[PDB]
Amino acid sequence: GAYKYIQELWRKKQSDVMRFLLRVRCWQYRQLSALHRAPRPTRPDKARRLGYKAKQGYVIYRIRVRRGGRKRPVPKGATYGKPVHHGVNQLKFARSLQSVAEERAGRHCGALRVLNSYWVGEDSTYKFFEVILIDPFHKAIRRNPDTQWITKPVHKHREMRGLTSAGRKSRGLGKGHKFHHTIGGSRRAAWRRRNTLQLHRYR
């Protein structure tokens, strides 16, 4: 009953009530460290529609990410190559900033498993995401077979492999005519199969 209002109130974040508390806390977030343990979700409807429950073993971090596109890491902007590759200053980094945010949360806490994350603020330079995490060895997680998929060792470091919903939006996969640059598995699995010379035994 209540959570339908919290969803709909959040979906108007230019109105004067909502753009007040979206910057009284964006001030409050910016005074803290780069990553930081939240005691609770700051918007509980969004957390649980992404897989959060209010029980032992689940944990929320808000982490801070510096906005902007990437500069090419090269001394004095000299890239030493053909003139198409002088791109020092307009470069855009094909993985999203939220995916960067989930990555260095599961890199600090290498024991925790990462489920997904959501947006809770941006200023002009910093962008604030709440990343929700899972202890895979707590017995509230290692019981309950609706949660036992993530205590299975192929889900180790899902954002270093780009498997969560933040990171898979940059892999470019999906069904359709708009997405058949990656038509077996991934982008580099298609490339290997479009470019292998499949010479048969009788040919």
């Binding site: 339908k4 209002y5 108007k12 230019q14 109105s15 004067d16 009530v17 909502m18």
Partner: protein, 97 residues
């Protein structure tokens, strides 16, 4: 005299009448959900572009109002739908008084 090209094309079969699949009735308004959006737009208010829009939509003109809604909200099919529900607030503000 059935034929392949023209204006009545194709092999003639007879249609199967069926109650449509439930996924297609997805964006209907479903009156409790109408209540949640209509209650919450008076505790929260209007965006800054759609307060400037409805102070062009009462005095200035309408072709310039939609030209302002064309730019901010994306397309033309979205700009008219926004322009007509700001006009239904502007009608309910003034003519329901």
């Amino acid at each position: 005299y059935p034929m392949a090209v023209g204006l009545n094309k194709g092999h003639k079969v007879t249609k199967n009448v069926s109650k449509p699949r439930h996924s297609r009735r997805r964006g209907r308004l479903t009156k409790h959900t109408k209540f949640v959006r209509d209650m919450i737009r008076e505790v929260c208010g209007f965006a800054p572009y759609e307060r400037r829009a409805m102070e062009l939509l009462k005095v200035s003109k309408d072709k310039r109002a939609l030209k302002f809604i064309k730019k901010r909200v994306g397309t033309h099919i979205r700009a008219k739908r926004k322009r007509e529900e700001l006009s239904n607030v502007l009608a309910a503000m003034r003519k329901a008084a």
